[PDB]
């Protein structure tokens, strides 16, 4: 909206910068049209919207923190819960944080979130991760493993693993309705790309993606009207 | 409107070319913003909209054609009418061409138009012009003059000189209402930039710029309704 | 003024960035000189300084606002004053706003200003304008006309039409000294480029360009000295 | 780590190339920061890490080779096993190749891999593929079909189809524990984009993506310690 | 640290902008490597770190100000002290400003600093300087000299001349320990590049570059511990 | 020397690439000439050739190594020799390494060289240095000091401090001929830019720059001729 | 040869512009080497040196001038000599102009040269040419022909046709030694690309390319020595 | 010829785009002049106009087609005519196609044209050629030879070999006037760059380049006038 | 100062090229500001002004010329004066050339200048230099030495070595006041980078840098006033 127009003796004057901008935009538009066929080649393919910046809200149910020291070329176990203990923490923490649930809503996805921090300054390394999502209830995960083709955690040191992909409620009901409560539990390992031992802070959360169906209606103090 | 969106297991996919275009446009927009201050410097000044491509309609009342041969460094007289004859041609040709005048309208401007054509192929020169818009009624313009600081006609070989900047009607009324009918008449000369004699076709028109105020109403066959 | 100079054992040290800048400026200056002949070609022509950002001060005598809805391809009349009413508003509003006039000054120009606003969000169209500056006092302008080769209002939705192009004073004196008070009045129409009806806010002002000749002298409380 | 530093009479000298590099990097860093907002627009989206260059190791259990000649616009059947025969080959080849299994591990994914080779030099065409992953056990796949909206195999002539989306063990146990052993079997077709018959070598493998959880402990000759 | 990582069905997703940045950095790194041999050519040479932005702290012992008017092509004397008076000012001002000296320290360098200011706005010229660092004690410097191959003061109008390039102490001790106290004194001249007389403010300081060897120990209120 | 020439029927043929290269070089040469005036602006200034890559040979008389741990914002003393011990090491090590001295030669410069290495991988910091070149023989340098405007060691982690800025010989003669043997000794400190303690390897050498005047004559086994 | 070198306290200073030029040339040389393989591709082919700017000297034996007017799409005959008359002019003019022939020499080539000039200014067209080099002695060339796939004369309006692609001597000897004197004669036509008749000046010369074998010896006035 | 000119109150207005184009052309012209010296370096050499797109008309006397299969690294004989049979085909086909010859004309050149086509789609190879233009009449060319430094046929798969670089007539006259009719005959071989056998269509033509000297006269029905 | 301004009906016109230049300069200024932070990084370092193009005047006291032939990889002695003879030449030549000394002045620096010329055309090599500035008075320099890490003379074949970094007077006074007259003498060697013997012209000068303190006063013919 730069510039302006005026009329002197029937003649229409227009701001020079606006006119030169109109010319430039024409030039750019021709260039854009000339190479528009390449966009259609690129449009044979698609990318995925970031699930956490994307649709649904994020509810971050932080679970715990722990410090581990990790030898080079190894990974340390983050958590060793039974399926029951994982379910107890998942159910209790989510329900305790979210109640009262006042809207219709659906959990789109449940993510296991690792937030990883170096405990020392002036270090240069990146984080690695490996996981399993279940095991024989009598299988106890090794506390430390060797690194073998791990996941490389992205530059922001956050990794999120998808786990998935209002009535009266309690944990016993929830647990009884789970078919294999003792089998499924995230067993997650964290390592680094460092050639020295590193001390790391691990913060574990459950990130729930939720879509609410909130009606376009007022909340009134009772009685209504 | 390239590309599309789809949802698979809650996840939103978008066309790659569209995304890369969004990124590119962001990049261009940053560049545009970075140098936007220069547009404001340019916007301290204005340019004039072309009167003939601009507002008002064009009514081209062609008057006559003539062939002249023009010696180098000279200009030949196009027209030598008295003021009365110029007014007779202006009034008669416009009114005869435009009647019936069925709308409210105003003449914004009257232009004397020279359309100039070379009469030979394989020539390379441009046209020149000089003029006077009035003279003592007893002054007869020279048929040929020497070129001295002329107007250079633009590349499209058209030059337009502004001259300006429904009741029962007739020329005698018009003429009687003009104050100095014998003084004002365009006296126009045409030359070239050629070093040889050139044969030129000269076509002279009066170009009227008109704005109509046509009501947003139907024309009915009488009687209406 | 970056960098600095110092002397060690007669030897003069100078900041490296300043020196590299001196070299770069030399390079730029050579480039500028090499293509300076093109500036002289461009300097065969001139542009007009924006009258409102340019010399003289702006005194905006706002007159009125009105809302009009405009059908596609039509224009609605903004004002239908007689010449007398236009003169009354022009004189009364300017003089009432500007008095006391304490300096010698001259009105350079008088502009009729349209400020145009869409009354709805999420619309995409531009404004158009047509006008007449006078009419037979018995001519009443059509309330709505069809659009025909209009003025296109610039991107900032402001159009200004030039109308032009201390003693005891009163409107009757002013009116008596105007030769054709009932003939000259701006009759202005506003339309859009929209294919739907649009609701528009029209704000009309008179913009006076004024140059003051204020002496370089003190104002004292009387008596002076 | 180019260049160096030295001190002469308290004054610090530094290598010129290193300094000019520091200046250049500053320049690049400013440019990077200026357009960093576009990275955030791109970061609204994500791409998928190549599963075979990505986490987990690759175990390529090659199954068989075959030569087929393929008419233009047709595709030839690669394999026509029953579900039982597919399971026998999958189980037998994997277990025979991998035993002894000395670590805890999980199969992340099972991929059906087509490696495709032209059997003639100086040809120019690309490969196509279609598949089904199961069928009525009494359905026998056509040996040859017409090409209709196929998968286009990428430039490296390898296509991988995901099929998925230590105790004493034997095939009879495995087979008995599969619910619908006779229904699921990859039925894969290969064609080309050629306008002539082409002779093609087809090599079929099962590619297992495996993550091992190898403890960070020694292997000793028994008895340990 | 833009973007992030997540895992869906074993597959690793990474932010698109981060990936495109990894690609771009690879591209830049290849370019940097390709032309790295030129850095080694540049590294055959070195530049000097700015002594005042460089190591050691700056202690600016301002001495005096004076206004001089300087004719074109001439330089005016800034100071005409004897060696004794220069030593008295140097010793007294430094010691009076710096005591108490609570750390081990060494003066790296002593600089004579001219800060030069135009006394009028809307002038365009640069400053010049000439100097001698000693003279026969019976030599009295000319108050004004002609300019001949002077030092050109850098754009920031500061010139610094190197002059060089805790016990009980007093000036008489200092003076007695100087071998030729009456010979060494800065005799400094200031001119301009102007073709008119210019009025200039001259501010003279002694700038001491000092390195302190402050132990990494506490200061306690006595008695300690 | 690409391409070639041949003659066919008196006509001279020349390789096309060579001709296009001649044209390109002409183009480059014009560009070089056009901006050659900027080189002369840059040539108002000079840079210093790297003393160690430059004239004279380098004789690196390594003296000792030591490991120090350095707290953030502090510097640790490298050496605390008396002047006598510094002279003993300088004389003994140089003479023992260089004898037999078989040519006329001159020591251009003596440099104190610090080679600095991090003792841990995956660290990111740079080194700092401060020094004194002499002190009261009864002054014992602090083992650790706080960092204050230090020298920043260049990217290659080498810093060199200039110290400067055949007959029968022995140390007692050398020592007796030194005027102030106990005063001059390099007292050098090393720190880092790290926010944590760092363990550093310090290697100290004396680097002698030597020019030899070796005659252009044979060495013969005696007797000659 | 810009800049210079100097030595201060063993240290070598070099002009900054020269150093930056050394760096730039290194950069250019790397670029040149990187793309040098393309020169070898271009060097698979050769171009011909201009015969007239190339080896041998040019002796221009001008023969005659003539003016012809040429209708569009036609060509006019330049010359209609018999073979005998062509030989007489060739022999007589060359020998009369060149004698005395004082050196050993060889005619490399004989060229028929047309120099073509427009006789009018402000025309825009190019020249065309057709020719025959011999004909039945009883064949008389048409004075005017239609243009059919002619040679287009280059921008400099010169066309040269190769015709080829000391003893006592006379024309009768020369003529008798020619085998078919009456058959070979250049019959040359000139036209234009103009759509109008053009008046053209035609200047015809014989251009002899000659190589002399002049001994590296003095000319003396007789008797020698 | 974009834009236009008009005159308002003596002042000359010109289209902005035309003016900016005049400025741009000035800029381009300066650039062209700056590097014009390189054109003169390139003009030391010349290239040859394509004989078939160049002067003279093309008369393509197609002779025959044949299919050959060619083993890798070999070439197959195209034609094995005696000189007499080659002359019979050349004479008969040209004269039969061209009669009636109604104009004076000259054959500039005779070319042997190979048009080569792959007989299969989806192949990637180029063609090669070798030839001899004559042989002992008792020499019979080998049907197949090995490829050794052949001509590589250009991308358009056409190769043309120059062979060279109105009275009552008959073949017996023509044959009797040829000196060595049985010796000269094109013996041409065609191969490929393929590593497999290829089936090729070979089409052989004689391409005559002809210049006609058609008089600029009418053809009349007899009797004329 | 291109273009101009004019006023028509209160409106200000300005030259188009000047306006476009104002816009361009704004654009350049934004770019300059955007990257100005890099200048400050470069300004952490300084370069040295060329001493000979820099402050002080140059007085070139040429001493002698000599021709030497230099074998590859060797250097030839330029001068072998005793300290006394060097002092005699330095004193005598300077004082004889400079008297009468009519101004107060100071020698800033004394430089030993080698000007080196090839004695043959069509050679391609550079010059080298080595030197000593003093020696035992009984040390006679070798006439020829082998090249070992020499100074490389800059492209302009001039090398300058700093040696440093009105009463009745005579050489005996000067000599008596020098402390070690027989020790200090420049002993300079010159070589080349050639692989063949080269014949070189060596011209040796003493270049004095002098600053004069000429008072801004008239010289009058006596008696003054």
UniProtKB/Swiss-Prot annotation, chains A, B, C, D, E, F, G, H, I:
The keyword Lyase does not apply. GO terms for molecular function: structural molecule activity. InterPro entries: Polyhedrin (IPR001746). GO terms for cellular component: viral occlusion body. The keyword Nucleotide-binding does not apply. Belongs to the polyhedrin family. Component of the virus occlusion bodies, which are large proteinaceous structures, that protect the virus from the outside environment for extended periods until they are ingested by insect larvae. This is Granulin. It comes from Cydia pomonella granulosis virus (isolate Mexico/1963).
């Amino acid at each position: 909206h730069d510039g302006t127009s005026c009329v002197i003796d029937n003649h229409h004057l227009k701001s020079l910068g606006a006119v030169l901008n109109d010319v430039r935009r024409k030039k750019d538009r021709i260039r854009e049209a000339e190479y528009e066929p390449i966009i259609d080649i690129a449009d044979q393919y698609m990318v995925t919207e970031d699930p956490f910046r994307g649709p649904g809200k994020n509810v971050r149910i932080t679970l715990f923190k722990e410090i581990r020291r990790v030898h080079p070329d190894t990974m340390k176990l983050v958590c060793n819960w039974s399926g029951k203990e994982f379910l107890r923490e998942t159910w209790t923490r989510f329900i305790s944080e979210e109640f009262p649930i006042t809207t219709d809503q659906e959990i789109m996805d449940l993510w296991f979130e690792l937030q990883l921090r170096p405990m020392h300054p002036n270090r240069c390394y990146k984080f690695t991760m490996q996981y399993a999502l279940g095991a024989h209830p009598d299988y106890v995960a090794h506390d430390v493993i060797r690194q073998q083709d791990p996941y490389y955690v992205g530059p922001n040191n956050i990794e999120r693993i998808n786990l998935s992909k209002v009535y009266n409620d309690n944990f016993e009901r929830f647990f009884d309705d789970v078919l294999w409560p003792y089998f499924y539990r995230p067993l997650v390992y964290v390592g680094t790309t460092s050639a020295e031992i590193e001390e790391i802070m691990i913060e574990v959360s459950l990130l729930f993606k939720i879509k609410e169906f909130a009606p376009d209606v007022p909340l009134f103090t009772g009685p209504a009207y």
